[PDB]
């Protein structure tokens, strides 16, 4: 569960769009201050992806390990502009680190 890893991975990874700060802005990406335990397309006043609806799905651990893998794929249509990651111990602690970002 490296933190100062997922760190350097999230600064440049997804923390590019997404903000791991309370308060974040809509911008290429939504913000990710609790996105844990939370539904999806909720972030009002946003341009979420007519797939950022249409999934509709509870995120967490899994929904994440599975998404992450794939966000095309999971999200048919998404701007999320990513590849995908395939390491498990990569997925397993880029995660950690936003427990302990967003949930800090
Ligand atoms: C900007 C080019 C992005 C990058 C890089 C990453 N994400 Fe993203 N994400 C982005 C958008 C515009 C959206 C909404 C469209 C959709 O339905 O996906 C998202 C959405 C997610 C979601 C779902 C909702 C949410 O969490 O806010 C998750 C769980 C998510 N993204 C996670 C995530 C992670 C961990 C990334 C790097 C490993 C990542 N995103 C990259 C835009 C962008």
Do not use: A, L
């Given at each position: 569960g490296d933190v100062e890893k997922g760190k350097k991975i999230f600064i440049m990874k997804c923390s590019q769009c997404h903000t791991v700060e309370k308060g974040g802005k809509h911008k290429t990406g939504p913000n990710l201050h609790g996105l844990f335990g939370r539904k999806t397309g909720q972030a009002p006043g946003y341009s979420y992806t007519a797939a950022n609806k249409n999934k509709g799905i509870i995120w967490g651990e899994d929904t994440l390990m599975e998404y992450l893998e794939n966000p095309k794929k999971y999200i048919?249509?998404?701007?999320?502009?990513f590849v995908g990651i395939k390491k498990k111990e990569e997925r397993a602690d880029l995660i950690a680190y936003l427990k302990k970002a967003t949930n800090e």
């Open positions: 048919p249509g998404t701007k999320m502009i």
